Design a protein around this ligand. Sequence first.
Ligand SMILES: O=C(O)CCc1ccc(OC2CCN(C(=O)N[C@@H]3[C@@H](c4ccccc4)[C@H]3c3ccccc3)CC2)cc1
Ligand SMILES: O=C(O)CCc1ccc(OC2CCN(C(=O)N[C@@H]3[C@@H](c4ccccc4)[C@H]3c3ccccc3)CC2)cc1
Lengths: 316, 316
Amino acid sequence: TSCNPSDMSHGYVTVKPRVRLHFVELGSGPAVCLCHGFPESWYSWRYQIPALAQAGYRVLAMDMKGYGESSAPPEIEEYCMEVLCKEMVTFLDKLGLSQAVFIGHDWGGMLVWYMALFYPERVRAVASLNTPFIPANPNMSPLESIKANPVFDYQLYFQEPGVAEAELEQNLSRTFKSLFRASDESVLSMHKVCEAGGLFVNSPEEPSLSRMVTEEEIQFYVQQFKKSGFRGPLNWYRNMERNWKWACKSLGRKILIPALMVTAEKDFVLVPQMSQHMEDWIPHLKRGHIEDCGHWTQMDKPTEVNQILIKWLDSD
Amino acid sequence: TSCNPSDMSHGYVTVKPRVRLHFVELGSGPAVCLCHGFPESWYSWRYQIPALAQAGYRVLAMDMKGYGESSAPPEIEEYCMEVLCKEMVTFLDKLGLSQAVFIGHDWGGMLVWYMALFYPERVRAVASLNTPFIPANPNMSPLESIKANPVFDYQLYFQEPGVAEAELEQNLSRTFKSLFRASDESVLSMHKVCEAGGLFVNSPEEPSLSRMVTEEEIQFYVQQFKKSGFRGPLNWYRNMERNWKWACKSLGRKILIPALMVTAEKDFVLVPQMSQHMEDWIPHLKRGHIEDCGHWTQMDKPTEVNQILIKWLDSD
Ligand SMILES: O=C(O)CCc1ccc(OC2CCN(C(=O)N[C@@H]3[C@@H](c4ccccc4)[C@H]3c3ccccc3)CC2)cc1
Ligand SMILES: O=C(O)CCc1ccc(OC2CCN(C(=O)N[C@@H]3[C@@H](c4ccccc4)[C@H]3c3ccccc3)CC2)cc1
């Protein structure tokens, strides 16, 4: 039911001179591109990859730009949505794929919505875990939105280059054990990160292992993040104004391709209600909802994710 | 239309601890595995890769074991057909492909025939360029056949490890310019190589560039063979007894899957008549024949090769 890295096919595509994207590939059938979130890995889809391949799909599980074996340039602007989306289009071009299904989670979810929005001709169908699609508001900036919702306070802490990197890189095992937990096992507040000083300022120095993960799984992420660290990943958060301006160029165009929104009951940041009016701008939207499921959806409720994704893939 | 290496998707599969296979991958649809000959490269399929992908296939063009970015262990036994075939099956396993169409040329052609014989469950259909399928004769050794068939004298020269390697690696540019030519541009013979002292003993020191290839194309081969040299590739020739004994264990069984044999009029070693009685053992065999075509079929007559392969793939 899982993936051993050394038993996978590893693919590499150069999308521009010094930027190549790494992916793992399994199965035959229609192409399904899986896009993980922050701070994760292709390996976050470990339970989906075999299930989707067994269900008759060709699965391409990405290391997103900044992660794993994919390139991680230091410049903030390399990680704006416009650049990341164009790169994923180039990825498809070099692989000779006219279209793929795009399934994303967290920041990967944001990316796949923008792929569906701006490059619908290359997106056969789109699915997001947790991350809603909300049309850009030309009137209020991203900075004003974060004031209007204090649950996104931590995003301010991620802004200054090097600050969050230092904390997240200091002890990688502690970082991932602290983060990758079921909602009832949480050891972190994301209410007021900035005044406290950081994410882990008064969370355990030696956290226990979540019921969700093994020591071996944790050590995989540890080894992956030794390659490039957290700068590239955090740069995803540092293009708020650029992403806003790009998203506003959408005007009011709808997403007319088949779409799936999957909500997670106990994700306390990307809460299910954030998705509530999505059918207004996505006419062919279908839904899934997973109870007792926190942020780390693929890990927390793999069986439920697999059922929902496969049902949806097979029907449209 | 051809391939630029830096614009391809490069895949890597570890089939056992010391051995990984490299391939380039283009297109969507049924999996088609392309297997090159001696001393070539995935790049020998450069004209077929985009044509087949455009025709609606997912093309996997291999660096065969011993070549390019694939592993090239020193031991002779690592290149016997039994080992090479098992590894190709493991390759399919790791990619999650239950079956593939196998298309081979030269030594690659011999490989795909053996795949069809011993692993019919993993081969959807089989095609060979130039290399016929001749059932093993248990009453004659391979060594005995080379004495009866002097055109294969050069194979005796390839036996002694280190000898052919030194000549072929002495000047790679000269090596490939001398080999890769149209039949009417020939600058060497394979009549009496051993007593002559080598392959290039009295062929030009600075050969002209064949009509078939550009300087840039030659230099790609040069660059590729700088990594591991000719030991691995030549080891394909140094398993005659093992291959013969293995082939003899398949005597009774037949190839029932769809099959294509493409002959080249001006291949003076793998002559068309070598294939003449193949329908005795494969009654449903289909055929293509290319006029004015030397040994390097894909390079020599790419348009004709593309037409024949696509017609065949689309019908059976
Ligand atoms: O139009 C409008 O109003 C705005 C619409 C809009 C809607 C959604 C949206 O989500 C994107 C930005 C925020 N983002 C995260 O910060 N994920 C948290 C990671 C994290 C944060 C902090 C530390 C580590 C990891 C995850 C996490 C979440 C919950 C629990 C654990 C981890 C995910 C993607 C963007 C825009
Ligand atoms: O049962 C029976 O009668 C025997 C049946 C049987 C039938 C066929 C057969 O072909 C295999 C062995 C011979 N082999 C080569 O030596 N290829 C030559 C390369 C080469 C040789 C020498 C130098 C460089 C490259 C190519 C070449 C050929 C012609 C011109 C240029 C290059 C290709 C595969 C094996 C068994």
